[PDB]
Amino acid sequence: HMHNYVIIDAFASVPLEGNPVAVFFDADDLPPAQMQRIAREMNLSESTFVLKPRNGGDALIRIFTPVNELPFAGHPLLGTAIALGAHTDNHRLYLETQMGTIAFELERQNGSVIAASMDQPIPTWTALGRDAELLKALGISDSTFPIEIYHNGPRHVFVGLPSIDALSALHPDHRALSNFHDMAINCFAGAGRRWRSRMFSPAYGVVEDAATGSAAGPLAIHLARHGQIEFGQPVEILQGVEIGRPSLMFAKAEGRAEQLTRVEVSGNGVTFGRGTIVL
Amino acid sequence: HMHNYVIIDAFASVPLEGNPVAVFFDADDLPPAQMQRIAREMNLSESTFVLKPRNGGDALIRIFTPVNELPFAGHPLLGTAIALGAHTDNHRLYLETQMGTIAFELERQNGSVIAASMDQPIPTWTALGRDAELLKALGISDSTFPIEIYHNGPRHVFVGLPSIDALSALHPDHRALSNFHDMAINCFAGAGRRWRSRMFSPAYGVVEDAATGSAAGPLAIHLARHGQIEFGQPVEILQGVEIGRPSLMFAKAEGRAEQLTRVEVSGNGVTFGRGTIVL
Numbered sequence: 001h002m003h004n005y006v007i008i009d010a011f012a013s014v015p016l017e018g019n020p021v022a023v024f025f026d027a028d029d030l031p032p033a034q035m036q037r038i039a040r041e042m043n044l045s046e047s048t049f050v051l052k053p054r055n056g057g058d059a060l061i062r063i064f065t066p067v068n069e070l071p072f073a074g075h076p077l078l079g080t081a082i083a084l085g086a087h088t089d090n091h092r093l094y095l096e097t098q099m100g101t102i103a104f105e106l107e108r109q110n111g112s113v114i115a116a117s118m119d120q121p122i123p124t125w126t127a128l129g130r131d132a133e134l135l136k137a138l139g140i141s142d143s144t145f146p147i148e149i150y151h152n153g154p155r156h157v158f159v160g161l162p163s164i165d166a167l168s169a170l171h172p173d174h175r176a177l178s179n180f181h182d183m184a185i186n187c188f189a190g191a192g193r194r195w196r197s198r199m200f201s202p203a204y205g206v207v208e209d210a211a212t213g214s215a216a217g218p219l220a221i222h223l224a225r226h227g228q229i230e231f232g233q234p235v236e237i238l239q240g241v242e243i244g245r246p247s248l249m250f251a252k253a254e255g256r257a258e259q260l261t262r263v264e265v266s267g268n269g270v271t272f273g274r275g276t277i278v279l
Numbered sequence: 280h281m282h283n284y285v286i287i288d289a290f291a292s293v294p295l296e297g298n299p300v301a302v303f304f305d306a307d308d309l310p311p312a313q314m315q316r317i318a319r320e321m322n323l324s325e326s327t328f329v330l331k332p333r334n335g336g337d338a339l340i341r342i343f344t345p346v347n348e349l350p351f352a353g354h355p356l357l358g359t360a361i362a363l364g365a366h367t368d369n370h371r372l373y374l375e376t377q378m379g380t381i382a383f384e385l386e387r388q389n390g391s392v393i394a395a396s397m398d399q400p401i402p403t404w405t406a407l408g409r410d411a412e413l414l415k416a417l418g419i420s421d422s423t424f425p426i427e428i429y430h431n432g433p434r435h436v437f438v439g440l441p442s443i444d445a446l447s448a449l450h451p452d453h454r455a456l457s458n459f460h461d462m463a464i465n466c467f468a469g470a471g472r473r474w475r476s477r478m479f480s481p482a483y484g485v486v487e488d489a490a491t492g493s494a495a496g497p498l499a500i501h502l503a504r505h506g507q508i509e510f511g512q513p514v515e516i517l518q519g520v521e522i523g524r525p526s527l528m529f530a531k532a533e534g535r536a537e538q539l540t541r542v543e544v545s546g547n548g549v550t551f552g553r554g555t556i557v558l
C-alpha cells in the first residue's frame with residue numbers, strides 16, 4: 001500500500017557527492033514488474049528493493065536500472081547496505097543477490113552507519129583487442145598499461161593516462177564510445193596508493209559516472225598485475241571530480257592473479273533524502 | 280537546512296502514468312547553483328523550486344533539468360501547480376516564471392487538487408525545411424500535414440501519420456534524430472476530438488517522452504490551421520501509450536492563426552511520493 005525509501009549517496013560522506021541510489025524497504029508485496037516501473041519512475045541509475053531472505057542471509061536485494069534488472073551492481077549494493085544499517089544492529093550484513101550472498105562489514109558512529117566494505121565477485125579479464133578504435137574515441141594515441149576488459153557482472157575496460165592532468169583533459173567522442181557495447185570505459189591515472197578515475201558508458205546509460213563501485217575491484221587487480229601496487233595493498237580511487245560528484249572508493253585484491261582470494265571495495269555513504277511512495 | 284518535496288505524475292490520475300516532476304517547497308534559502316545540483320541528484324526530467332513572488336503572483340517557480348535551468352516547461356509547471364494546491368485554498372494560481380506569470384485554474388475534490396488548466400505562451404511557427412532528413416530518421420516516406428516547427432520556449436516539430444497503428448509502428452533511428460538540435464519531434468495521428476502522439480527528443484534528453492505538455496498547445500494550433508479542428512475546439516491528446524506511461528493532455532487554441540488570444544492546456548495530476556531532503 002505504501003513504501004518507505006531513502007536516497008543514499010554512495011562513496012561519499014557529504015550529500016550531493018558520490019553516486020545516488022534509491023532504496024525501498026519492505027518490498028515483499030511488490031511484484032518485479034512493479035519494482036521495474038518504480039525504478040523507471042525514480043530514474044536514478046538504480047533503485048533497489050529489500051526483501052525477505054531465501055537462503056539464510058539477512059535480506060534479499062533486487063537491483064533495477066530504469067530499464068532492466070541487474071544481477072549485481074557496485075555502488076547500489078554499497079548504498080543499500082548503508083541504508084539497511086539504520087534498521088539493524090549487526091556489524092556484518094549478508095545480502096542475497098542473483099549472484100549469491102555478498103558479505104558487508106558496516107561501520108557505525110553512535111548507531112549511524114557511515115561506511116561499509118563489501119566482498120565483490122572475483123573478476124575475469126582479457127585484452128580488449130580494439131585499442132586503436134577506443135583510443136581514437138577517447139582522443140589519445142596510446143594507453144600506459146595494457147587495455148584489458150574485466151568481467152564481474154558488468155564489463156569494465158581500463159585505459160591508463162600518464163598524469164592526472166592528462167586524465168582531466170580527456171574529452172571523449174561519446175558517439176564513438178557508443179560502439180562499445182555492454183561495457184564501461186574507465187580511464188585512470190595516479191601513483192602509489194592514490195589513483196584518479198573517470199568512467200564513461202553509453203552502454204550503461206551514463207555519459208560520465210560519479211563512482212563506479214563495480215570497477216574499483218578490477219582496477220586494484222589491474223594495478224597489481226601491472227606492478228603499480230602489490231596484491232594485498234589497498235588503493236584509494238577518486239572518481240567524478242571533473243563532473244562535480246567527487247567520490248572516494250577504496251579497493252584491495254588479495255592473493256595473486258591466478259588465485260585471487262578476496263576482492264574488497266569500501267566507501268562512505270550518506271543519506272540525501274527520505275520519503276514514502278503511494279504504492 | 281531541510282526541504283520537503285513531492286513527486287507529481289503530471290497528465291495522469293493514476294501513479295506511474297503521466298510524466299514525473301519533483302517539486303521542492305520553501306526554496307528561498309537555496310542559491311540557484313544548489314537548486315541545479317539538487318535537480319541533478321534527483322535526475323528527473325525536471326525539478327522545480329517554489330519561491331516567494333517578486334511581481335505580484337502567488338509564487339515564483341524556477342525549473343531545472345538535471346543540467347540547466349529552463350525559462351518555461353509544460354508538464355513541470357502543471358505538476359507544480361497541482362502540488363502547490365495542497366498548500367492553498369485559491370481556485371486560481373498565478374505562478375511567476377522567467378517568461379512571465381502563468382495563470383492556472385485548479386480543480387479540487389474535497390480539498391485535493393486533481394487537475395489544473397494553464398494558459399500557455401502563444402507559439403510562433405515556420406516550416407522545418409528538413410523533411411526528407413526527418414522522414415528518413417523516422418522511417419517513413421511522407422507526413423500527412425505540413426512539417427512545421429513551433430516555438431513557445433522549446434521547439435516542437437509535428438509529423439502526421441495516417442493512422443494510430445502507423446504511429447505505434449514507428450521505430451525511429453535515434454542516432455539520426457540527434458542531428459535535430461534544440462527541438463523535439465512530435466508524431467501524431469487521430470481524428471476529430473481524439474488524437475494520439477509520440478514525442479522523441481535527443482536534444483531534450485529523452486528517447487521517448489510520456490507527456491509533452493509544452494507541445495499540446497502547438498498541436499491544437501497545428502490541427503486547427505490544417506483544418507482538422509476549429510479554433511476554439513478542445514482536443515484530447517493521448518501520449519506515451521507505447522512506452523507504458525499513458526498521459527492525457529487537453530488543449531485548445533482560441534482566436535485565429537494570425538491573432539491567437541489564448542492557448543490552454545489542462546490535465547490531471549497525482550502524487551507518487553513525498554519526502555524530505557537533508558539540505
Ligand SMILES: Nc1c(O)cc(-c2cccc(O)c2)cc1C(=O)O
Pocket residue numbers: 045046065070071072073074075076152153154155204205212213214
Ligand atoms: N550501474 C551499473 C549498470 O548500469 C549496469 C551494471 C551491469 C551490467 C551488466 C551486467 C551486470 O551484472 C551489471 C552494473 C552497474 C554497477 O553499478 O555495477
Ligand SMILES: Nc1c(O)cc(-c2cccc(O)c2)cc1C(=O)O
Pocket residue numbers: 324325344349350351352353354355431432433434483484491492493
Ligand atoms: N522537458 C522540457 C525540456 O527538457 C526542455 C524545454 C525547453 C527547451 C528549450 C527552451 C525552453 O524554454 C524549454 C522544455 C521542456 C518542457 O517540458 O516543456
